[PDB]
Amino acid sequence: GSSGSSGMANYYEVLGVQASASPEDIKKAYRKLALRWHPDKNPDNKEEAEKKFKLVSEAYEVLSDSKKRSLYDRAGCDSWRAGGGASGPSSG
């Protein structure tokens, strides 16, 4: 028994594209990816592939969308901790 996992996986990485990528590239890439990381296509390891299948699909949407993509981007590398840049607290 053990607690669930957070993930710590970069959507862009999973798919294999850049942030400045087009909304068409990600789509075409995903589709093909799904089959590539497909469990049925991989006899040796079925489960291992399955997981990837869900990821390639999950991210595909996260980016495909404008809100999800922007939200994920604005966040940055780390998601748990946002405030991690140039220290300079100022109010007015």
Short mmCIF file of N, CA and C in Angstrom, two decimals:
data_model
loop_
_atom_site.label_atom_id
_atom_site.label_comp_id
_atom_site.label_asym_id
_atom_site.label_seq_id
_atom_site.Cartn_x
_atom_site.Cartn_y
_atom_site.Cartn_z
N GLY A 1 0.81 -1.21 0.00
CA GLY A 1 0.00 0.00 0.00
C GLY A 1 0.84 1.26 0.00
N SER A 2 0.35 2.30 -0.66
CA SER A 2 1.06 3.57 -0.74
C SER A 2 0.15 4.68 -1.25
N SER A 3 0.53 5.92 -0.97
CA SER A 3 -0.26 7.08 -1.38
C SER A 3 -0.11 7.32 -2.88
N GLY A 4 -1.13 7.93 -3.48
CA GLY A 4 -1.10 8.21 -4.91
C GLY A 4 0.11 9.03 -5.30
N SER A 5 0.35 9.14 -6.61
CA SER A 5 1.48 9.90 -7.12
C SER A 5 1.02 11.23 -7.72
N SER A 6 1.87 12.25 -7.59
CA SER A 6 1.55 13.57 -8.11
C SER A 6 1.69 13.60 -9.63
N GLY A 7 2.81 13.07 -10.13
CA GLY A 7 3.04 13.05 -11.56
C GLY A 7 4.35 13.72 -11.94
N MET A 8 4.42 15.03 -11.76
CA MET A 8 5.62 15.79 -12.09
C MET A 8 6.05 15.53 -13.53
N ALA A 9 5.07 15.46 -14.43
CA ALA A 9 5.35 15.23 -15.84
C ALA A 9 4.96 16.44 -16.68
N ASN A 10 5.89 16.89 -17.51
CA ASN A 10 5.65 18.05 -18.37
C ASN A 10 4.79 17.66 -19.57
N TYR A 11 3.61 18.26 -19.66
CA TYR A 11 2.69 17.97 -20.76
C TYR A 11 3.40 18.07 -22.11
N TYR A 12 4.03 19.21 -22.35
CA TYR A 12 4.74 19.44 -23.60
C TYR A 12 5.69 18.28 -23.90
N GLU A 13 6.40 17.82 -22.88
CA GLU A 13 7.34 16.72 -23.03
C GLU A 13 6.62 15.44 -23.45
N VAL A 14 5.62 15.06 -22.68
CA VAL A 14 4.85 13.85 -22.97
C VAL A 14 4.50 13.77 -24.45
N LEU A 15 3.93 14.85 -24.98
CA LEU A 15 3.56 14.90 -26.39
C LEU A 15 4.79 14.99 -27.28
N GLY A 16 5.74 15.82 -26.88
CA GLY A 16 6.96 15.98 -27.65
C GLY A 16 6.91 17.19 -28.57
N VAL A 17 6.34 18.28 -28.07
CA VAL A 17 6.23 19.51 -28.85
C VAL A 17 6.68 20.72 -28.04
N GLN A 18 6.77 21.87 -28.71
CA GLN A 18 7.19 23.10 -28.04
C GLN A 18 5.98 23.97 -27.72
N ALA A 19 6.18 24.94 -26.82
CA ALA A 19 5.11 25.84 -26.43
C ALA A 19 4.64 26.69 -27.60
N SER A 20 5.57 27.04 -28.48
CA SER A 20 5.25 27.85 -29.65
C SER A 20 4.71 26.99 -30.78
N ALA A 21 4.30 25.77 -30.45
CA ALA A 21 3.76 24.85 -31.43
C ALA A 21 2.36 25.27 -31.87
N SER A 22 1.89 24.69 -32.97
CA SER A 22 0.57 25.01 -33.50
C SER A 22 -0.49 24.07 -32.93
N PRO A 23 -1.75 24.50 -32.98
CA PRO A 23 -2.88 23.72 -32.47
C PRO A 23 -3.17 22.49 -33.33
N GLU A 24 -2.51 22.41 -34.49
CA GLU A 24 -2.69 21.29 -35.40
C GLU A 24 -1.62 20.23 -35.17
N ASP A 25 -0.40 20.68 -34.89
CA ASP A 25 0.71 19.77 -34.65
C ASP A 25 0.43 18.86 -33.46
N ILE A 26 -0.01 19.47 -32.36
CA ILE A 26 -0.32 18.72 -31.15
C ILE A 26 -1.39 17.66 -31.41
N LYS A 27 -2.41 18.04 -32.17
CA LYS A 27 -3.50 17.13 -32.50
C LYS A 27 -2.98 15.92 -33.27
N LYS A 28 -2.32 16.18 -34.40
CA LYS A 28 -1.78 15.11 -35.23
C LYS A 28 -0.79 14.26 -34.44
N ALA A 29 0.07 14.92 -33.67
CA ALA A 29 1.06 14.22 -32.86
C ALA A 29 0.40 13.27 -31.88
N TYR A 30 -0.58 13.77 -31.13
CA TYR A 30 -1.29 12.96 -30.15
C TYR A 30 -1.85 11.70 -30.80
N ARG A 31 -2.77 11.88 -31.74
CA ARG A 31 -3.39 10.76 -32.43
C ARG A 31 -2.37 9.66 -32.70
N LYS A 32 -1.31 10.00 -33.43
CA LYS A 32 -0.26 9.05 -33.76
C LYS A 32 0.36 8.47 -32.50
N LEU A 33 0.61 9.33 -31.52
CA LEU A 33 1.20 8.90 -30.26
C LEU A 33 0.36 7.81 -29.60
N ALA A 34 -0.93 8.08 -29.45
CA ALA A 34 -1.85 7.13 -28.84
C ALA A 34 -1.59 5.72 -29.36
N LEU A 35 -1.49 5.58 -30.68
CA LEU A 35 -1.25 4.29 -31.30
C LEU A 35 0.14 3.77 -30.95
N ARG A 36 1.13 4.66 -31.00
CA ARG A 36 2.51 4.29 -30.69
C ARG A 36 2.61 3.71 -29.28
N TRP A 37 2.12 4.46 -28.30
CA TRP A 37 2.16 4.02 -26.91
C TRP A 37 0.97 3.13 -26.59
N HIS A 38 0.32 2.62 -27.63
CA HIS A 38 -0.84 1.75 -27.46
C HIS A 38 -0.44 0.42 -26.83
N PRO A 39 -1.25 -0.05 -25.87
CA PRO A 39 -0.99 -1.31 -25.16
C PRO A 39 -1.19 -2.53 -26.06
N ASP A 40 -2.27 -2.51 -26.84
CA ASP A 40 -2.57 -3.61 -27.75
C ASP A 40 -1.45 -3.80 -28.77
N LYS A 41 -0.85 -2.69 -29.20
CA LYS A 41 0.23 -2.74 -30.17
C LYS A 41 1.52 -3.24 -29.52
N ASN A 42 1.60 -3.13 -28.20
CA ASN A 42 2.78 -3.57 -27.46
C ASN A 42 2.47 -4.82 -26.64
N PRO A 43 2.90 -5.98 -27.15
CA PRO A 43 2.69 -7.27 -26.48
C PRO A 43 3.51 -7.40 -25.21
N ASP A 44 4.81 -7.15 -25.32
CA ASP A 44 5.71 -7.24 -24.18
C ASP A 44 5.08 -6.61 -22.94
N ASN A 45 4.79 -5.32 -23.02
CA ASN A 45 4.19 -4.60 -21.90
C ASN A 45 2.90 -3.90 -22.34
N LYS A 46 1.78 -4.32 -21.76
CA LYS A 46 0.49 -3.73 -22.09
C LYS A 46 0.14 -2.61 -21.12
N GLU A 47 0.23 -2.90 -19.83
CA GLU A 47 -0.07 -1.91 -18.80
C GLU A 47 0.78 -0.65 -18.98
N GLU A 48 2.10 -0.83 -18.98
CA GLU A 48 3.02 0.28 -19.15
C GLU A 48 2.54 1.23 -20.25
N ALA A 49 2.20 0.66 -21.40
CA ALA A 49 1.72 1.45 -22.53
C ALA A 49 0.42 2.17 -22.18
N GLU A 50 -0.54 1.43 -21.65
CA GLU A 50 -1.83 2.00 -21.27
C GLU A 50 -1.65 3.37 -20.63
N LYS A 51 -0.91 3.40 -19.52
CA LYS A 51 -0.66 4.65 -18.81
C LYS A 51 -0.32 5.78 -19.78
N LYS A 52 0.69 5.55 -20.61
CA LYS A 52 1.11 6.54 -21.59
C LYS A 52 -0.06 6.99 -22.45
N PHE A 53 -0.93 6.05 -22.81
CA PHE A 53 -2.10 6.35 -23.63
C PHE A 53 -2.96 7.43 -22.97
N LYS A 54 -3.17 7.29 -21.67
CA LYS A 54 -3.97 8.25 -20.92
C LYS A 54 -3.27 9.60 -20.84
N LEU A 55 -1.95 9.58 -20.69
CA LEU A 55 -1.16 10.80 -20.60
C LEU A 55 -1.22 11.58 -21.91
N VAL A 56 -0.89 10.91 -23.01
CA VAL A 56 -0.90 11.54 -24.32
C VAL A 56 -2.25 12.18 -24.60
N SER A 57 -3.31 11.60 -24.05
CA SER A 57 -4.66 12.11 -24.25
C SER A 57 -4.94 13.27 -23.30
N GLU A 58 -4.54 13.10 -22.04
CA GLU A 58 -4.76 14.14 -21.03
C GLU A 58 -4.10 15.45 -21.45
N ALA A 59 -2.79 15.40 -21.68
CA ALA A 59 -2.04 16.58 -22.08
C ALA A 59 -2.61 17.18 -23.37
N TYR A 60 -2.89 16.32 -24.34
CA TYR A 60 -3.43 16.76 -25.62
C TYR A 60 -4.51 17.82 -25.41
N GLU A 61 -5.36 17.60 -24.42
CA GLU A 61 -6.44 18.54 -24.12
C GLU A 61 -5.92 19.74 -23.33
N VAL A 62 -5.12 19.46 -22.31
CA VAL A 62 -4.55 20.52 -21.47
C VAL A 62 -3.97 21.64 -22.33
N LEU A 63 -3.31 21.26 -23.42
CA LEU A 63 -2.70 22.23 -24.32
C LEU A 63 -3.70 22.68 -25.39
N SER A 64 -4.40 21.72 -25.99
CA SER A 64 -5.38 22.01 -27.02
C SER A 64 -6.23 23.22 -26.63
N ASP A 65 -6.66 23.25 -25.38
CA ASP A 65 -7.48 24.35 -24.88
C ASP A 65 -6.63 25.60 -24.64
N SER A 66 -7.28 26.76 -24.65
CA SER A 66 -6.58 28.02 -24.44
C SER A 66 -6.40 28.31 -22.95
N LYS A 67 -7.45 28.03 -22.18
CA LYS A 67 -7.41 28.25 -20.74
C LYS A 67 -6.46 27.27 -20.06
N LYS A 68 -6.61 25.99 -20.39
CA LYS A 68 -5.76 24.95 -19.82
C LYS A 68 -4.30 25.17 -20.19
N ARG A 69 -4.06 25.48 -21.46
CA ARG A 69 -2.71 25.71 -21.95
C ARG A 69 -2.08 26.92 -21.27
N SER A 70 -2.79 28.04 -21.30
CA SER A 70 -2.31 29.28 -20.68
C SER A 70 -2.08 29.08 -19.19
N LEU A 71 -3.06 28.48 -18.52
CA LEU A 71 -2.97 28.23 -17.09
C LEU A 71 -1.73 27.41 -16.75
N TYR A 72 -1.49 26.37 -17.54
CA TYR A 72 -0.34 25.50 -17.33
C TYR A 72 0.96 26.24 -17.62
N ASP A 73 0.96 27.03 -18.69
CA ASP A 73 2.14 27.79 -19.08
C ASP A 73 2.49 28.83 -18.02
N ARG A 74 1.56 29.74 -17.76
CA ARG A 74 1.77 30.79 -16.77
C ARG A 74 2.38 30.21 -15.49
N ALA A 75 1.90 29.04 -15.09
CA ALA A 75 2.40 28.39 -13.88
C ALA A 75 3.91 28.22 -13.94
N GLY A 76 4.39 27.56 -14.99
CA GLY A 76 5.82 27.34 -15.14
C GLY A 76 6.22 25.92 -14.82
N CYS A 77 7.52 25.70 -14.66
CA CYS A 77 8.04 24.37 -14.35
C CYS A 77 7.33 23.78 -13.13
N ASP A 78 7.37 24.50 -12.02
CA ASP A 78 6.73 24.05 -10.79
C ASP A 78 5.28 24.50 -10.73
N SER A 79 4.41 23.62 -10.26
CA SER A 79 2.99 23.93 -10.16
C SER A 79 2.59 24.18 -8.70
N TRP A 80 3.17 23.42 -7.79
CA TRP A 80 2.88 23.56 -6.37
C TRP A 80 3.30 24.93 -5.86
N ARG A 81 4.48 25.37 -6.28
CA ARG A 81 5.00 26.67 -5.86
C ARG A 81 5.09 27.63 -7.05
N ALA A 82 4.25 28.66 -7.03
CA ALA A 82 4.24 29.65 -8.10
C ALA A 82 5.22 30.78 -7.82
N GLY A 83 5.18 31.31 -6.60
CA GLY A 83 6.07 32.39 -6.23
C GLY A 83 7.51 31.93 -6.10
N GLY A 84 8.25 31.96 -7.20
CA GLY A 84 9.64 31.54 -7.18
C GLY A 84 10.47 32.24 -8.24
N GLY A 85 10.44 33.57 -8.24
CA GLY A 85 11.20 34.33 -9.21
C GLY A 85 12.04 35.41 -8.56
N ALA A 86 11.91 36.64 -9.05
CA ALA A 86 12.67 37.76 -8.51
C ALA A 86 11.97 38.37 -7.30
N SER A 87 12.61 38.24 -6.13
CA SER A 87 12.04 38.77 -4.89
C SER A 87 11.93 40.29 -4.95
N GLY A 88 10.73 40.79 -4.71
CA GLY A 88 10.51 42.23 -4.73
C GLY A 88 9.08 42.60 -4.37
N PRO A 89 8.70 42.35 -3.11
CA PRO A 89 7.36 42.65 -2.62
C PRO A 89 7.11 44.15 -2.49
N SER A 90 6.12 44.65 -3.23
CA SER A 90 5.79 46.07 -3.20
C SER A 90 4.28 46.27 -3.28
N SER A 91 3.77 47.22 -2.49
CA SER A 91 2.35 47.51 -2.46
C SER A 91 2.09 49.00 -2.65
N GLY A 92 0.88 49.34 -3.06
CA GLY A 92 0.53 50.73 -3.27
C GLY A 92 -0.97 50.97 -3.21
#
